Amino acid sequence: AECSVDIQGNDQMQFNTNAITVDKSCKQFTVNLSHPGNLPKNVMGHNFVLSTAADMQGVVTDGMASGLDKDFLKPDDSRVIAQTKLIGSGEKDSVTFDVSKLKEGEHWMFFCTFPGHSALMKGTLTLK
Numbered sequence: 001a002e003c004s005v006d007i008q009g010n011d012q013m014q015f016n017t018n019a020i021t022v023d024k025s026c027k028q029f030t031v032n033l034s035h036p037g038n039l040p041k042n043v044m045g046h047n048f049v050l051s052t053a054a055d056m057q058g059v060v061t062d063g064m065a066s067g068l069d070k071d072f073l074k075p076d077d078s079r080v081i082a083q084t085k086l087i088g089s090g091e092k093d094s095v096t097f098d099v100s101k102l103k104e105g106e107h108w109m110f111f112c113t114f115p116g117h118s119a120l121m122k123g124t125l126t127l128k
């Protein structure tokens, strides 16, 4: 592939990767998220959520208060660069966003906002 990445989150509360790079040549970048586990999304749900390193704690916290039916995401949360839905076993979702949204010199994290998962399910995205 190119200007896309495949990410898996499993039954062990892990992303398969902790670091993503995006080609500064890309206008747009795609994240394809899957869940190769057997647990359902209300006990081991995963989403792919991207923000700067410094907004990460805020988005996680309010994502928790927004609740399962809202994908553990605050609706139209302005800190969120890109988000998928919350998925569980056997499910998938992709998200495409404008690379232009990565300003140069910022630092970005991706993570799951299912309560508790970010302690393990987090990783770095960087502009390549």
Ligand SMILES: [Cu+]
Pocket: 009, 044, 045, 046, 047, 112, 113, 114, 117, 121
């Ligand atoms: Cu998760």
